[PDB]
Amino acid sequence: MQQYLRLKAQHPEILLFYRMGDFYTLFYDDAKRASQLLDISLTPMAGIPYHAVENYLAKLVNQGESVAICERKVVRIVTPGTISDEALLQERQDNLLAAIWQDSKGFGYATLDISSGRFRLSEPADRETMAAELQRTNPAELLYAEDFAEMSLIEGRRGLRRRPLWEFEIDTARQQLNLQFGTRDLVGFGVENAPRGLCAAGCLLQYAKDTQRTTLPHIRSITMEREQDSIIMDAATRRNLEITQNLAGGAENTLASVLDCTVTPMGSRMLKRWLHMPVRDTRVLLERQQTIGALQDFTAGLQPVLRQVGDLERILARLALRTARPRDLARMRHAFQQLPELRAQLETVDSAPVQALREKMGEFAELRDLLERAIIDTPPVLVRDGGVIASGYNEELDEWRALADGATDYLERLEVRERERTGLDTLKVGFNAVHGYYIQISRGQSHLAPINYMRRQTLKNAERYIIPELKEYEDKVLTSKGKALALEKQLYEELFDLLLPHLEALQQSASALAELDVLVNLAERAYTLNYTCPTFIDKPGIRITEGRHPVVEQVLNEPFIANPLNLSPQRRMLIITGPNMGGKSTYMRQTALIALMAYIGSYVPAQKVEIGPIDRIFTRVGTFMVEMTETANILHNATEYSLVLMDEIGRGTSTYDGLSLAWACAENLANKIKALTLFATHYFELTQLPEKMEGVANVHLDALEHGDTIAFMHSVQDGAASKSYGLAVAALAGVPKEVIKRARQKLRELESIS
Amino acid sequence: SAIENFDAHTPMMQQYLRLKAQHPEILLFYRMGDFYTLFYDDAKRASQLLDISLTKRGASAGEPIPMAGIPYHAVENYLAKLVNQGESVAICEQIGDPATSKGPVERKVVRIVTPGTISDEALLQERQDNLLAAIWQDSKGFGYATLDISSGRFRLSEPADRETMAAELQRTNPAELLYAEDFAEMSLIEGRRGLRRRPLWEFEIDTARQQLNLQFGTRDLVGFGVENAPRGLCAAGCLLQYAKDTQRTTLPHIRSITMEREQDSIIMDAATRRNLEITQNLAGGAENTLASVLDCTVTPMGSRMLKRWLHMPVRDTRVLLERQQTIGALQDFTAGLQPVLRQVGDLERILARLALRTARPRDLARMRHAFQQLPELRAQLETVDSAPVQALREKMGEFAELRDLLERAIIDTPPVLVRDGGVIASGYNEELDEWRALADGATDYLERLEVRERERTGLDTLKVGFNAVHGYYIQISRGQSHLAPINYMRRQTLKNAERYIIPELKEYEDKVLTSKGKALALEKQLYEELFDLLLPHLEALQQSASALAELDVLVNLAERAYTLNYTCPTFIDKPGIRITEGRHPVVEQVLNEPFIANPLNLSPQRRMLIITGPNMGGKSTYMRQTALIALMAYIGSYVPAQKVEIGPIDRIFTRVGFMVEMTETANILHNATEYSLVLMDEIGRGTSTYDGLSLAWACAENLANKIKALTLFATHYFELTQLPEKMEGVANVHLDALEHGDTIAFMHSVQDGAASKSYGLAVAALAGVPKEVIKRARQKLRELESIS
DNA sequence: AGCTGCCAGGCACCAGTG
DNA sequence: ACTGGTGCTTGGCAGCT
Ligand SMILES: Nc1ncnc2c1ncn2[C@@H]1O[C@H](COP(=O)(O)OP(=O)(O)O)[C@@H](O)[C@H]1O
Ligand SMILES: [Mg+2]
Secondary structure (H helix, E strand, C coil), X not given: CHHHHHHHCCCCCCEEEEEECCEEEEEHHHHHHHHHHHCCCCCCEEEEECCCHHHHHHHHHHCCCCXXXXXXXXXXXXXXXXXXXXXXCCCCCCCCEEEEEECCCCEEEEEEECCCCEEEEECCCCHHHHHHHHHHHCCCEEEEECCCCCHHHCCCCCCEEEECHHHHCHHHHHHHHHHHHCCCCCHHHCCCCCHHHHHHHHHHHHHHHHHHCCCCCCCCCCEECCHHHECECCHHHHHHCCCCCCCCCCCCCXXXXXXXXXXXXXXXXXXXXXXXXXXXXXXXXXXXHHHHHHCHHHHHHHHHHHHCCCCHHHHHHHHHCCCCCHHHHHHHHHHHCCHHHHHHHHCCCCCHHHHHHHHHHCCCHHHHHHHHHHECCCCXXXXXXXXXXXXXXXXXXXXXXXXXXXXXXXXXXXXXXXXXXXXXXXXXXXXXXXXXEEEEEECCCHHHCCCCCEEEEEECCEEEEECHHHHHHHHHHHXXXXXXXXXXXXXXXXXXXXXXXXXXXXXXXXXXXXXXXXHHHHHHHHHHCCCECCEECCCCCEEEEEECCCCHXXXXXXXXXXXXXXXXXXECEEEEECCCCCHHHHHHHHHHHHHHHHCXXXXXXXXXXXXXXXXEEEEECCCHHHHHHHHHHHHHHCCCCCEEEEECEEEECCHHHHHHHHHHHHHHHHHHHCCEEEEECCCHHHHHHHHHCCCEEEEECCEEEECCEEEECCCCEECCCCCCCHHHHHHHCCCCHHHHHHHHHHHHHHHCCC | CCCCCHHHCCHHHHHHHHHHHHCCCCEEEEEECCEEEEEHHHHHXXXXXXXXXXXXXXXXXXXXXXXXXXXXXXXXXXXXXXXXXXXXXXXXXXXXXXXXXXXXXXXXXXXXXXXXXXXXXXHCCCCCXXXXXXXXXXXXXXXXXXXXXXXXXXXXXXXXCXXXXXXXXXXXXXXXXXXXXXXXXXXXXXCCCCEEEECHHHHCHHHHHHHHHHHHCCCCXXXXXXXXXXXXXXXXXXXXXXHHHHHCCCCCCCCCCEECCHHHECEECHHHHHHCCCCCCCCCCCCCCHHHHHCCCCCHHHHHHHHXXXXXXXXXXXXXXXXXXXXXXXXXXXXXXXXXXXXXXXXXXXXXXXXXXXXXXXXXHHHHHHHCCHHHHXXXXXXXCCHHHXXXXXXXXXXXXHHHHXXXXXXXXXXXXXXXXXXXXXXXXXXXXXXXXXXXXXXXXXXXXXXXXHHHHCCCCCEEEEECCCXXXXXXXXXXXXXXXXXXXXXXXXXXXXXXXXXHHHHHHXXXXXXXXXXXXXXXXXXXXXXXXXXXXXXXXXXXXXXXXXXXXXXXXXXXXXXXXXXXXXXXXXXXXXXXXXXXXXXXXXXXXXXXXXXXXXXXXXCEEEEECXXXXXXXXXXXXXXXXXXXXXXXXXXXXXXXXXXXXXXXXXXXXXXXXXXXXXXXXXXXXXXXXXXXXXXXXXXXXCHHHHHHHHXXXXXXXXXXXXXXXXXXXXXXXXXXXXXXXXXXXXXXXXXXXXXXXXXXXXXXXXXXXXCHHHHHHHHCCCHHHHHHHHHHHHHHHCCC
């Protein structure tokens, strides 16, 4: 099997599916890797069925493997960041290609969603911001330079792709980006003086073109993401807030599972992008807010219609790549048919941004009509076999179809004519590839076959014959069908030619429809869930009246206790004592989630929120080394515009070391950084802090003991906690009474010295 | 909805719905000709699970019947997909002859494939046990029983409380768990796989006694040491009924049951098992476990046995001494024995298939190959001076007579299945040879008929062939076919060839097919007859496999003790553990750097150590290695140390630092005795500065002064280093660290006394906390330190 | 060597002949 | 009530290329 070997050497770094009957086949180290990635057997040999190939390609590319398909020669390759087939993608998750590299000056980073054409670059200023961007964008495939120094950033990632340095050269990158966009320079995209970033974008674009071997006319723009434009969140914070993924790895019990009731897959993906990148420009935020208020009375009417638009964005990528299949055009048509209704419903909405979305959404009446006429109501999945183009669209096609129908009409009549003549009630006409059309008589009747019948195939219980009249009309059927099939294919290709000149407008429409989806959904969410519009103030501050945690209030069936928060430059830090038991943690996270939601333009779970500018959110909530590392990161990077949530640091080391660290951290956050800080602690000794320094106050959670249990209440109250509950929980858990009694004595002994 | 009374159904569906009612909650494969077939919701589910088409079966009454199916010869692959997903499937076969049946042929469910009752090699993992279990809860405690259907190993026990019952589920990890409908403590059992809610009657004591005595051929169960154990018997009765119902044959490999008493083994709680990473690491994999290091057995049955031992340390001094002795005596013999032992294979599971009468031709061939190793193993073991080894050598037997039978009965490399024949060797049965020689002159006769008919007709395209649908034929090309003899009777027409039959060839067809069917049926009869001749010897065969498996474990443990530099431990009268130069057996193999060996001295006078030292200093590892050395000593293995003396250990408890921690601490305080080894790892959590520590202090006191267990108490609370002065039986040790200015170095060496200091600030600095913050923390620390 | 379609063997269904 | 045709799952392989 030397034929496999020399073909494997052609792409030695990619799994090679090698076709062999009804299977694709892998050998040597490819078999091993594949066996462990897919739950299939070894023999070294693995095999995957042919009819399920797209399924196994979906799994492999979701796990970061490129795959070459060999049918010999390599005739198809799929890579994880460059797929655009519906079978290979998850409907409600973005799938990005990215490239990274590094200067002595700093980093360059670029991402592309090959379906939507959304192309971004950035130049992260340091290791931490780069790590945060990688986690946020979570690229399915990641191109990096050979000489990349900071390998620890990307080492554990799926879909890594080591690239030569010359692919990151600035002059090549500019020339190529300018060619792609039809520009002389990149000034119009605001990236002309971002060379670190452009280098990454150029390597990425070169790779994307190499995987497709096709123009990418849907990639018409690039945008730079600046640090000051967004609320920075590091990976640990992103994880701890459970924005789109929970701490266990799933999608339930997240902020998105409550807020994302979008109706299109493109709307879902956009909302999730917004949730992970809160914007600091209140001008954008005020517009989003005003749109959410103005769409309130319209969501019931809009959503059912919007649902029918579908994933127009991903459908348009396939038009751009000329891979769109008959049902993609039928879905595009169906979306066009929703537009007059959406336009009519949106006409009376009092909002400049809704009216702007309405314009941008378009109408495309002439494309609607084209597809109504050109394609049948519910076409087949593939165009390969025809039955796609509607009658009345092309006179030549209708004619070939008529001649085919008349020849098949004739043969059906021949069947009845031959049965009648022969008196043979089993006689029939059929068709297959080997014999073309044939007359079949059963075994028991077949000795009465007329003598002109020419025997051609004996079956266990039948005989098949031809006569010249059968072959005559066979040829009428096959040549007519063949002509019609080839004509359907040419008419279908011509639909691409008529649609593609409108691609830029179509992309704008789908982007508008996706944004409408998001904003109509946030509007329904706000109204349904009793949210309020936050206001922005000039200086750091968070003033919340009856705030709630937006996830916990919908998932638990116990009543949610709403709470106030008052943070300002004069009251910058709260020391939170009392039992934790989830209540402290929830009160802290709900603070971050309210800040996050305000800063995506959403209403918030509260009676009232006023909020100042926030640059970064740190959430050290949820080994001692890992707590101290995360604490270090907060102290090194927080500013007076930062929101810091800290959860009982000092646990995991000695009493006096932990108290000493917690006290130092608190002072540094209060007096040097001046962040707005919620500082949950178990140390009663830390409640003396308000007496020793300005801007610091005590609050606490308490418990109610009753019957034979304890109710940990979630009401945040002024002042220090005056009780501990560890021994009460120990008694309820069955620790022997004599042990509890001795612990109570040691406890008073220990506490009475302070 | 159609009213589907009995009379509204066709004869086929009446039969089918009756068999389905026997198995209402599980998939039913209903044999219809070449297809196992499913209907209604079974079809829809099978379609989704097995990725086969959902179709339908027409009805004259009106509602179409959802249908799906698979050809009978592909059943095994589909059974694998189902059982891997925890699904049971009832297999219904055709019993009757359709030619002599008016209506539908007689159909029976002949077996039910379930996750814990599989015995087929393709459905099992080689190196892992696959148990069925049954569990029952009383007002006072639990009954539990386990069966390994592929070996016949049958056990009962009566775990006294919830924590011990949890430990037993973790240890035995049943693939299928039968539980009584009135089970209260559902937290132990829900979200386990293979869960099977059973009616209470299946746990009735008198029925259990009746069925067990019937299975064993006994009047009572006194001789098995379980007559006394009704709680356990109720679970074992449920289990045995399930085993019988699933297999629907006799089960002669299940010849005994044994009670697992608390006193016979070291009971490790759930946390201990998980924290010592015996067979599973903390993140769920098989890597970097104790087994990954100690398991270099060469047979699957040895690999499974060793893992059972690691999980169940034995308290019987004599057994331990015998195992130790065996390991010492076998050390220079491991290289010779291991290649030969490897050739024995998984005789254990082959013998189960023999007992169930499902053993395939390559099972019997591997059985033969195993018998052929026994004389060599006997010769190698004769010279080993050790009574326990000679007792194993004896128990492994020889079976010369059965070896000879398989050598004569079966060919060198038989096919996978017996259904197509070609298994029984020539010379074994003269009638078979006769029938075969008929389908043998065959090949030659057809070539001669061909050349003769070709030369005689003068038609150079003439060929003789066979088709399964149409039979033997003489073929002539279409262009030459008009020239065929008028005598040639047309059989099958093709596009470009005509095929004919003549009386001579038809006669030859009838005798070759008659004789092929005869030879096949005779083969199947003789193959079944091999079972009849093997099975009388099953008891000695099973004891042989068990001896072969134990030899493999012990020979392995000898090789490990040599290669990893282990030593033989000794046992003392009273609780205590004296280790010189002890190591963590796993950590020393994965670390890419020297393991720092450490002492330990526990005795009734020095029974609790408060262990301090910096985070990352080696506190947890030091505790774990103590328990691992104990565990290894108590399976009969040599241990990672220069010297070990160890007293009796009844139990090992572990708590690695809300309601759960507290509850687990109380169970330890309620259940440890003076013979317990207790590992408390940074416990004591409260809501304020001192409540958690206060509790840890009081728990320590209770362990030291009332219970008197041997306790390793690792803590970050320096306040507890004051315990030794207050409390008899308690001492300080610590994990050494050095501070050379900027940084801290972890020496990993255990020293007597408390650390000079705690090192929280230094660990924080190491973690990256800004120097200016560490500076202020040190200032606050000096204030705090001036209090006393 | 690749692609199409008959067949395996049960049983009920269905339409023509009592 | 018979007689003789049809249908239905998936995997094997003859029968064509
Ligand atoms: N005796 C030893 N020799 C070498 N390395 C050790 C030794 N004991 C522990 N270590 C290493 O030190 C690390 C920390 O050990 P650990 O037992 O977790 O300390 P602690 O529980 O005090 O925080 C472990 O990963 C282990 O690899
Ligand atoms: Mg530890």
